[model samples]
Target chain A: MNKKTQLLEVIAALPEELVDQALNYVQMLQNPIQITPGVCGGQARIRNTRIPVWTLVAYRQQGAPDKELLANYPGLTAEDLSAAWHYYEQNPEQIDREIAQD
Target chain B: MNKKTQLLEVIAALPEELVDQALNYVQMLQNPIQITPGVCGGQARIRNTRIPVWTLVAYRQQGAPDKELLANYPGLTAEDLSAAWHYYEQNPEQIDREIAQ
Candidate 1:
């Protein structure tokens, strides 16, 4: 089976609560991550993917098409990306500060 | 042959970071974890261990002996308990609020 089909199957199979549990069961499944000083200058991100929530928020602000984002980041599912967006809304200061960094 | 020796054998084996990874491999190994919304009212804990950081801090504050704590939660390593203490020191308010709840 193709990776896409397998991913779809995995997504389709899990109960919403268990999706995090299943990935967590598999590995360093730190969904909607932490701001640990050791990791990427204390950035919040999707676990292992290292795609920062701030970067997603920044891209959306500059008007990057959402469809294009999904295509560009095959590691992220729609839920993962939406979580980033939702987090950005709840904590704008956190992401905004991160985006300004050199 | 005993669980304690086997536990010691496992601990004697890792490169430290990988011990957590090894446990991360074993279960919901979300060590020194994140405070997610649904899990334990979003308080950080020793992941699947579910024994709260604040609870440890509160116990320590009330003068519980360290050895007693170590004996109480067998699921935790010395390092796991230390991390909780470390986090509590750094984020007293977080634990204080959690403890109050």
Candidate 2:
């Protein structure tokens, strides 16, 4: 069978519990935080873009309100901001280290 | 041995001509670009920033001078702008498609 047909067949046979896992996996596959070598030294950043999740966290700590931060980065959305916060929550150590950098 | 010591030893053992290649590799590694999946649909962007190279190319094409573009993105430098243009030159199709978007 073709690639899509094969995938669909396997997905159709998956149990409900397994389907839930697949859904979660798909969500993660489409997640915004991307970490790759040679890009900002492998720092965790927003999807497709180079904006580090930690920088947004730092801006908020420095009294830069969400309103102003969004205004500053026109490319960012509230959803993107939320994802950055999510990334921070999940990787506090890395995010903290990034923010600590001068 | 430790990682730094091993790396230094390898560099020391390399021929002069080969050393040039290593230097170029290091420079490429340091080049300002962020390309990864999911973020802006895996578009090529500036280093440690959300600014896309194609967006800058678009701004330039639309008559935004380098100085004004720099002012708009104070986080960027002339060097960064040069790198963005360099990226556009090498990947004209991708940059043009991104601009079209």
Candidate 3:
């Protein structure tokens, strides 16, 4: 199937509430992913600090729940995870960057 | 000017911190734009309850501050508004649907 058809299938399979969540990540993937400065920001770090997306994806690959993911990154919620997963799927290149560091 | 050019200009004019926020909104605009159910959810209502984005945008068009916007929608923060405005600009059609009501 063509790219458009594949994208349509993905959209069709996604729950409506989840579609916007997915779209947010797709857009994030399109850009140069950044680690925003300071506490309280989405990209803010804890301890020495790291962007939660990398750690969350790693944990997800190991099978973590939304609550566990949020617990690992204080100040984040399930919605944030939903958003992050959507981004990771769309931007494999960014995820690859994190993997390279690992 | 072409749509692509207009989009590029908007993208260029936006500050880096604001770009992702804008992108989030832009993506939201492309969809059917549903009113998600329940209180904890982003689109949930309060009192009789309305989606905060509607009221917030109305107030903003009337000149409310970011703090004021958050004050009106207890669960929402400034980042949400930045996201919403970016969405509003990108999907005027969806915003118009809200405005139509």
Candidate 4:
């Protein structure tokens, strides 16, 4: 089957809750928080401090250094970062959304 | 702060995970399964049979006849339909997506 067909089949098999979660995840990835240069752009803030979306995206892309992932994005607790990662993992469509935006 | 500022502040305050969930829900809402008339459009199927998205959307909109929600959409068990509703409620964006599309 084609990609669309495959997606339909997979969706058909998935539980509604899972589908909902997956859909939500995709939407999140599509829209990212934008920080203007003068605004929250000078520093990287994950928790409250300045942090880069790139750092979070990179950590998620590369394996190892898992413990230091939080450190890379200062101000963001591990839980905070992890939650974002978890959301991305659950919704694979996020990968697609990111690529589309790029 | 204005609406934009308010959104930024609220997002800043939200836990990343919750934000992630919210975003995902919005995306899901933006996209819905489409069925051509010749394909999955003849009947309403939740489980295996055809079912209308309209039926599901309506049930979710109206806060009544909870028991019959599933019955109205044959082939769909309460769990199946409920799951869809659960997804829509958590990510209210679906409502907007529906309206936009």
User: Could you say which candidate leads in DockQ?
Assistant: 4
Q: What is the per-residue lDDT of model 1 for residues A1-102, given as tens digits with 9 covering 90 to 100?
A: 343333334344433333445444333333445456677767887766667888888888999877878898888777777888888888988789888965
Model 3, residue B44: displacement in angstroms? 47
TM-scores, chain B, all models:
0.63, 0.70, 0.45, 0.38
Poorest 10 consecutive residues of model 1 chain B by lDDT?
Answer: B22-31
Question: Which candidate, 1 or 2, would have the higher lDDT against the true structure?
Answer: 2
List candidate 3 segments past 4 Å from native.
Answer: A1-50, B1-101
TM-score of each: 0.39, 0.40, 0.28, 0.25
By descending TM-score, how would the candidates be arranged?
2, 1, 3, 4
lDDT of each: 0.65, 0.70, 0.55, 0.49
Residues A11-77, model 2: lDDT tens digits: 4444333344444444444566767786778988776678888888999889998789889988888
Q: After superposition, how far is residue B39 of candidate 1 from its true place, in Å?
A: 23
By TM-score, who's the top model here?
2
TM (chain A) per model:
0.62, 0.69, 0.47, 0.38
Report the C-alpha lDDT of model 4 over B1-101, residue by residue, as the tens digit: 34333333444454544554454343443333333456554422243335545456755567646577756545456565665565556645654455345
* Candidate 4 chain B: worst-modelled 10 consecutive residues by lDDT: B41-50
DockQ by candidate, in order:
0.03, 0.01, 0.02, 0.05
- Candidate 4: which docking quality band? incorrect
What is the Cα-based lDDT of residue B19 in candidate 1? 44
TM-score of predicted structure 2: 0.40
Off by over 4 Å in 1: A1-30, B1-101
Stronger candidate by lDDT (1 vs 3): 1
